[PDB]
Every structure is written in C-alpha cells, then in structure tokens.
Design a protein around this ligand. Structure first.
Ligand SMILES: Nc1nc2c(ncn2[C@@H]2O[C@H](COP(=O)(O)O[C@H]3[C@@H](O)[C@H](n4ccc(=O)[nH]c4=O)O[C@@H]3CO)[C@H]3CC(O)(O)C[C@H]32)c(=O)[nH]1
Length: 393
C-alpha cells in the first residue's frame, strides 16, 4: 500500500514524529499518506508516522486518554474547539516559536487557530460546504440551479412532485443544521452566551421537518449521502467539499457543484468550515519538534497543497497553492475546483469553546434527530438541548 511504504520508511529512521489523524479511508487517507511518503523520501532518516485513530470523535477520545497516560504524539489533527480544550491543559506549542512561516495562509483559517494573539494550529485539511446537484435531473425538468433559499425550496418541491420522491438529501446532524441556521440569520453566541433554541434555530429545524413531512427532503440515516445514491431520485445535497471526489466516483448521473443558496441573489449563502488544523504538543522531544517544523512547512508548500486539494476537494489554505501549475491544470479542466474556492470566501465557524464537540453531537445533534426521526416538536427538542448545554457549560 502506502501505509506499508511509510512503516518501512519509519523502521530505518533515527527520529519518528507520530501524526494522529481521523481519516478512515478513501481520498483523504490516500492523499495524506502519499504526502507523508514524499516528505519521508526527502529526509535523511527523519520521518513522520501517520497513525489513523478512527474518526474525528475517536481521535479526540484517544488524545484525552493520552493526557491521562501522559504520552502525547508529536502531532494531531484538531478542530478549533479541540484546540480550545488542549490549550486549557496548556499542552500545545505556539506554531511561530518553531519559526514555521505563516504568511500566504488565508485569514479565514488562520484567524480560527489564533488564541489571544497566538497561533497554535496549522490549517491542513479545511473544507467548506457546497451545493452538490444532479445536473441531468434539473436540465430534464428545466429547473435552474437555485441561487436563494426560497428558490432552493421551490426547486425541491417541484422536482419531488415531478419524480415521485424527496430530492433534497441530508444527514440530520449539526453540520447540515448550520447551513440553514446560519442562512436564516442565526448566530450561536448572543452577548457572550451560547443559545441553541433561538427563533433562527427553531426556523431551521422546522424548515427541515416541514421538508420531511412535505415529501421534498430525504433523511439519510446509514452512511454518507454519496454512499446512498442510486436509491431514489436525487437532486441536491449540502455536504462538505471533502466528499467532492467520492460523489464524483459514486454518481451515475452528471454531477454539479454550485455555491450555496443564500438569502438573496446579492451574495452566496454561508457554508460551515469543517476539517482540521495540525497541532504540535509541548511534550514532544526537540528532535521530534524539528520534524514537526519541517513537515508543517512541507504541507503549507504550494505543490503539496495543490495535490491534497485536487485529490479530495479540501480548500487550499494558501494564496501560493492557487498559483501552482498542478492546481491550475486540474482547475482549467474541472471548474468545480474554482466553485469550492469561491464558496470558501463565505465561511462560518461553530463556536470554538472546549466543550462544543460533546454539545454538537450528544445534545444539539440528538435534538436534530429527535425532531427529524421521532417527530419531536422543533422548539421542545431545542429547549431541552439548550438546558443540557447550560447544565454542562
Ligand atoms: N470530532 C469533530 N467532528 C466534527 C466537528 N465539526 C464537524 N465535525 C465532523 O466533521 C465532518 C466534516 O469534516 P470534513 O473533514 O470536512 O469531511 C470528512 C468526511 O465527512 C468526508 N467524506 C468522506 C467520505 C464520503 O463518502 N463523503 C464525505 O463527505 O471526508 C472527510 C474526512 O473523512 C462531519 C462528518 C462527520 O465526521 O461524519 C461529522 C462531522 C468537531 O468540532 N469535532
């Protein structure tokens, strides 16, 4: 494989810097390991070991264990909220103390990893939500790509009527809620305080539940949306750009990628930023830190960013990445790459509080499933969510 190549690289190494990640397979995993092999080849017995830990939630659970055992890897993927938690432990090294150079890096991703003036993460695999669509099925019924939230709902109801089933496919999770929430004018923080049960949150959870009843919105409860394609007519999903190639290779129809429907034609909708930043832990040996520095400079390089971004659909984190010829060759051939970049300009983050991982999954994500799947009243599922959260915070 690639993992076999790396283990052999790491066996004849003097210094190994462990990189713990939440890639379970497909392109994120291949493209991460192909990049590590190139780095390991270019070094003289200095080496990065990538250790898959399962997914992002398994990943944060394994870093929590590591803090109890007091044995941290050199490097890990981390969200903004994961970084918050590891900083409460003062467990992370400031990235510019390594003199890792950060100019070029898009403010969007860079602002998100700076805490009290100080950067503690390197943006590595950053995604934006886009509107995936079935170009064949819009073209057939003469339905334009919808620009605004109102045209998106019209278009959904029209194509579901025409084709005999619900055409807007989604996962009833916090990530999909955030697209409708953010675009009905919603905000997580009000005067310093977390709110999950605001008028915009009920509006967004009520829009999704209305969609299910009305036969235009399809909950996917088993696998990614792209893994369910070919069961019933599909027109639309709002899904991470990091699935881009997995939709490409799954879809038996002509795939489209558009910017998100917004409130008005004046401006695309906001997408949620997902994916992770690379952090380096203080308990790593100076030798291990030296490898971390070099690895981080590699992954920020235009070529390695070009090859990552093009293999997956993640957003290139630098200016220099868009001016690389491998990127410019992929994009001159496939306009969905410039769509994903154009969508990266209209980008919102979940709140970066340490406890937000727990909250997004077991509380706000449980309130979304109770409404969509068990017909709980939207306001009553988010009133519960907000109390459980307030009791945790
Ligand atoms: N732990 C933790 N997780 C978080 C947080 N915020 C968001 N999420 C999770 O981030 C994923 C989005 O991040 P992204 O890197 O953009 O995308 C993932 C995969 O989703 C995507 N993928 C893979 C296969 C496929 O067929 N389709 C496809 O889209 O590939 C990438 C690597 O696996 C969501 C997905 C989830 O893990 O299932 C639950 C959500 C947080 O704060 N903490």
């Amino acid at each position: 494989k690639p993992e076999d190549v790396i283990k052999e690289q790491c066996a004849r190494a003097k210094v190994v810097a462990e990189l713990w990640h939440g890639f379970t397979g497909g392109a994120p995993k291949a493209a991460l390991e192909n990049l590590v092999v190139e780095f390991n080849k270019a070094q003289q017995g200095r080496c990065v070991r990538p250790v898959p830990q399962g997914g992002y939630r398994d990943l944060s659970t394994k870093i929590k264990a590591a803090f109890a055992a007091g044995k941290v890897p050199t490097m890990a993927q981390a969200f903004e909220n994961n970084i918050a938690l590891y900083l409460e432990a003062k467990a992370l090294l400031p990235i510019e103390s390594l003199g890792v150079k950060l100019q070029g890096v898009n403010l969007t991703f860079l602002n998100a990893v700076r805490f009290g003036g100080v950067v503690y993460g390197v943006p590595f695999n950053k995604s934006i939500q886009v509107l995936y669509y079935n170009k064949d099925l819009l073209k057939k019924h003469g339905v334009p790509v919808p620009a605004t939230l109102e045209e998106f709902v019209a278009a959904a109801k029209k194509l579901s009527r025409a084709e005999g089933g619900p055409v807007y496919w989604f996962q009833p999770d916090a990530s999909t809620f955030a697209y409708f929430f953010f675009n009905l004018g919603g905000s997580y923080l009000k005067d310093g305080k977390l709110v999950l049960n605001s008028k915009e949150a009920v509006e967004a959870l009520t829009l999704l539940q209305n969609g299910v009843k009305e036969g235009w919105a399809k909950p996917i409860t088993s696998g990614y949306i792209n893994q369910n394609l070919g069961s019933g007519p599909y027109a639309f999903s709002v899904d991470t750009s990091a699935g881009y190639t997995a939709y490409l290779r799954a879809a038996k129809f002509d795939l489209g990628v558009a910017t998100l429907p917004g409130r008005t034609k004046g401006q695309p909708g906001y997408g949620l930023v997902q994916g992770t930043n690379l952090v380096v832990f203080r308990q790593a040996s100076k030798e291990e830190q030296a490898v971390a520095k070099d690895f981080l400079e590699f992954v920020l390089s235009p070529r390695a960013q070009a090859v990552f971004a093009t293999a997956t659909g993640y957003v290139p984190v630098t200016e220099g990445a868009l001016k690389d010829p491998v990127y410019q060759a992929y994009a001159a051939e496939n306009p969905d790459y410039a769509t994903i970049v154009r969508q990266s300009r209209y980008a919102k983050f979940e709140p970066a509080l340490a406890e937000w991982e727990q909250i997004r999954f077991d509380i706000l994500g449980q309130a979304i499933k109770e409404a969509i799947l068990n017909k709980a009243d939207p306001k009553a599922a988010l009133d519960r969510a907000q109390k459980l959260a307030e009791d945790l915070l």
